[PDB]
């Protein structure tokens, strides 16, 4: 039974502006099977009001999901994406890099 590993991008909907309401995105794709755990972290703390898109897939059958939460960025605050999947020995964390 095939297992494909998630790719993880973590990014803002619009260019980051401290104090201006924005959306924090964790895009997970390329993975099989569809059982995946995704959390958006604020300073290591799980966020409660995190929605996701309806499960879809690509021509190669790998699945993709967008998880997203409304948020107002700051210079101080740190955001990441915690992803768990059968293909991961450890839950994988990707920090959101504003400076890209």
């Amino acid at each position: 039974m095939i297992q494909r590993t998630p790719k993880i991008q973590v990014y803002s909907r619009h260019p980051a502006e401290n104090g201006k309401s924005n959306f924090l995105n964790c895009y997970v794709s390329g993975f099989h099977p569809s059982d995946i755990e995704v959390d958006l972290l604020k300073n290591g703390e799980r966020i409660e009001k995190v929605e996701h898109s309806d499960l879809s897939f690509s021509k190669d059958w790998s699945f993709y999901l967008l998880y997203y939460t409304e948020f107002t960025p700051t210079e101080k605050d740190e955001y990441a994406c915690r992803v768990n999947h059968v293909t991961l020995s450890q839950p994988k964390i990707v920090k959101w890099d504003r400076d890209m």
């Binding site: 039974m1 494909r4 099989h32 099977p33 569809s34 897939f57 021509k59 059958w61 997203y68």
Partner: protein, 274 residues
């Protein structure tokens, strides 16, 4: 330009945890317009674009009946398939189905598709001519035999060449403001010294629709295929897409490099320099 209507179905058996999980989603191009979740409370086909909401009760009853029938079909398939592969009752397995049509710029039939996968693997697929099947396994050939016997190809071809194209055109008209739009990409560059003798040039494309885009880096006009880092095109969450391409360049050589952005919303391809 060309357009597509595409339906994606995922069924996931969860032994001792209830009836299989079923998720249906429909797109027109890169825009989702409908969804069905087996676990959702509505137990209806649901809108996910404003232009579809103007469809009447007949549509939603019609699409609920049909998607409930897709769901049931996959429930049997899941049980059949594990039997075909002599698998246990206790393991969880996945059925995926994709079908739909493309129209060209003339809005006539261009392509039809119907593919089916067990546990993430090609199982049975309709061929380009929409007449014959491609069976992966010998189990698939047993399905191939069932479907040839029931003239599935013929029933499906009629849908893909006919109903599918007709409904794609209705959606393109009803959703004309959204679906017949091109959002040209907003572009910018960043520079980051990665070490003391080299830097990163990142080329950014934001707020573009459709998702289709080409981002290339040249040095003195020569493409740098193997030296380009290229992320998968990603959704913004507002109906638009983002992408970037990066090259690592020696300090002092920046001006030799150009980023090239090709997208349908652009009269000419953009050349960007640091």
């Amino acid at each position: 330009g060309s357009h597509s209507m595409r339906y994606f179905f995922t069924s996931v058996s969860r032994p001792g945890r209830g009836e299989p999980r079923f998720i249906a989603v429909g797109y027109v191009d890169d825009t989702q317009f409908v969804r069905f979740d087996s676990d959702a409370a509505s137990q209806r086909m649901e809108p996910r674009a404003p232009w579809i909401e103007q469809e009447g009760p007949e549509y939603w009853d019609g699409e609920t009946r049909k998607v409930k029938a897709h769901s049931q079909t996959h429930r049997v398939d899941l049980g059949t398939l594990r039997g075909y592969y002599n698998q246990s009752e206790a393991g969880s397995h996945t059925v995926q189905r994709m079908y739909g049509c493309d129209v060209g710029s003339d809005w006539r039939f261009l392509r039809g598709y119907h593919q089916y996968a067990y546990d993430g693997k090609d199982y049975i697929a309709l061929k380009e001519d929409l007449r014959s099947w491609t069976a992966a396994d010998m189990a698939a050939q047993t399905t191939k035999h069932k479907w040839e016997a029931a003239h599935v190809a013929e029933q499906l071809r009629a849908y893909l060449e006919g109903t599918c194209v007709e409904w794609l055109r209705r959606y393109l008209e009803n959703g004309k403001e959204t679906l017949q739009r091109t959002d040209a990409p907003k572009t910018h560059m960043t520079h980051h010294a990665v070490s003391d003798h080299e830097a990163t040039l990142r080329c950014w494309a934001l707020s573009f629709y459709p998702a289709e885009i080409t981002l290339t880096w040249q040095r003195d006009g020569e493409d740098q295929t193997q030296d380009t880092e290229l992320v998968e095109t990603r959704p913004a969450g507002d109906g638009t897409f983002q992408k970037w391409a990066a090259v690592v360049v020696p300090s002092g050589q920046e001006q030799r490099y150009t980023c090239h952005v090709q997208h349908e919303g652009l009269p000419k391809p953009l050349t960007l320099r640091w």
